[PDB]
Curated annotation (Swiss-Prot):
Mutagenesis / variant outcome for changing T156A: Abolishes activity
Residue ranges constituting the Protein kinase domain according to the UniProt record: 4-282
Quaternary structure and partners: Found in a complex with CABLES1, CCNA1 and CCNE1. Interacts with CABLES1. Interacts with UHRF2. Part of a complex consisting of UHRF2, CDK2 and CCNE1. Interacts with the Speedy/Ringo proteins SPDYA and SPDYC. Interaction with SPDYA promotes kinase activation via a conformation change that alleviates obstruction of the substrate-binding cleft by the T-loop. Found in a complex with both SPDYA and CDKN1B/KIP1. Binds to RB1 and CDK7.
GO CC annotation: Cajal body; centrosome; chromosome, telomeric region; condensed chromosome; cyclin A1-CDK2 complex; cyclin A2-CDK2 complex; cyclin E1-CDK2 complex; cyclin E2-CDK2 complex
Family: Belongs to the protein kinase superfamily. CMGC Ser/Thr protein kinase family. CDC2/CDKX subfamily.
Reported impact of L162R: Reduced phosphorylation by CAK and reduced kinase activity
SUPFAM superfamilies according to UniProt: Protein kinase-like (PK-like)
GO terms of molecular function: ATP binding; cyclin binding; cyclin-dependent protein kinase activity; cyclin-dependent protein serine/threonine kinase activity; magnesium ion binding; protein domain specific binding; protein serine kinase activity; protein serine/threonine kinase activity
Protein's name according to its UniProt entry: Cyclin-dependent kinase 2
Documented effect of changing T14A: 2-fold increase in activity
Gene3D superfamilies, alphabetized: Phosphorylase Kinase, domain 1, Transferase(Phosphotransferase) domain 1
Chain segments annotated as coiled-coil in the UniProt record: none
């Protein structure tokens, strides 16, 4: 900590606190995540160093990893705003479609890259997507397969957002696939368009049921194997799928077609990041400059 001047706290998670800080030596401004433990997991710490090699324009750069004094510090390149704040600042007007499209395209490139390197994000949400004045957007705060005991109560405690969680996770799947990130990104795409969260559940069952109420209760026809999943109950209510044109108006058919493919129930039917990049929706993609108030 003596090597870093804390300028201000820029957030807090269940097991980590994030500060904007300055390197007393270099003068470089960074985001510093501080994580508290009785020796700390080497396995979890392992995966970390791995992320250091994942360098891509749409992935926040992990500069350094420091284990010391029973604390783990992650130092990342600093960006000035997250998508959650940007969406809130743009709620009255809405983000222009060309910017929505550019951000979606860039995030898919980022995912295409991590997925081809067998890296999953696992917890995409607007707060973990960072933007800069040049029109770029980047994936931040990648989640580990396991880096700390199943989070359920933080020091001061904070409510975990389930809004972007894929249905297979909610149904108890033990192994996540790259498809979980595509689902989360589709939820974010919908939110940028409508200016309302797609599935705002306040509990795991409410989250699951909100997804079911919109996309219809899944069955073996659309999702083979779903009725044998760990948390599936034959007692789940059976909702009919809602007309998709009601879900994200006034998004055009190209956008709606791509979103429907990102939200397929079956992880194996859900579009890949690579395939999504080739979807007709991106035929006219460009890279606009966002109006950012910092
Ligand atoms: N790199 C980086 N930059 C940031 N700046 C920032 C500046 C302003 C705002 S805001 N609310 O719009 O004013 C938000 C973020 S956060 C961040 C992260 O890498 C990060 C992102 C999410 C969770 C945890 C971490 N983390 O582990 O450091």
């Amino acid at each position: 900590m003596e090597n870093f001047q804390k300028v201000e706290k820029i957030g807090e998670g269940t097991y980590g606190v994030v500060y904007k800080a300055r390197n007393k030596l270099t003068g470089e401004v960074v985001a510093l995540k501080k994580i508290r433990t009785e020796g700390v997991p080497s396995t979890a710490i392992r995966e970390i160093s791995l992320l250091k090699e994942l360098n891509h324009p749409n992935i926040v750069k992990l500069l350094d990893v420091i284990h010391t004094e029973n604390k783990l510090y992650l130092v990342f390149e600093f960006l000035h705003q997250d998508l959650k704040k940007f969406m809130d600042a743009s709620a009255l007007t809405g983000i222009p479609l060309p910017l929505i499209k550019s951000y979606l395209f860039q995030l898919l490139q980022g995912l295409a890259f991590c997925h081809s390197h067998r890296v999953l994000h696992r917890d995409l949400k607007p707060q973990n997507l960072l933007i800069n004045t040049e029109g770029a957007i980047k994936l931040a705060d990648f989640g580990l397969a396991r880096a700390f005991g199943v989070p359920v109560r933080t020091y001061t405690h904070e409510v975990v957002t389930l809004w972007y969680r894929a249905p297979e996770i909610l149904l108890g799947c033990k192994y996540y696939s790259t498809a979980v990130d595509i689902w989360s990104l589709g939820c974010i795409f919908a939110e940028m368009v409508t200016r309302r969260a797609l599935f705002p559940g306040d509990s795991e069952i409410d989250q699951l049921f909100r997804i079911f109420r919109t996309l219809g209760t899944p069955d073996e026809v659309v999702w083979p194997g779903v009725t044998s999943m760990p948390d599936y109950k034959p007692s789940f209510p059976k909702w009919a799928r809602q007309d998709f044109s009601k879900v994200v108006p006034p998004l055009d058919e190209d956008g709606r077609s791509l979103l429907s493919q990102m939200l397929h129930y079956d992880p194996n039917k859900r579009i890949s990041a690579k395939a999504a990049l080739a979807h007709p929706f991106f035929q006219d993609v460009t890279k606009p400059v966002p109006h950012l108030r910092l």
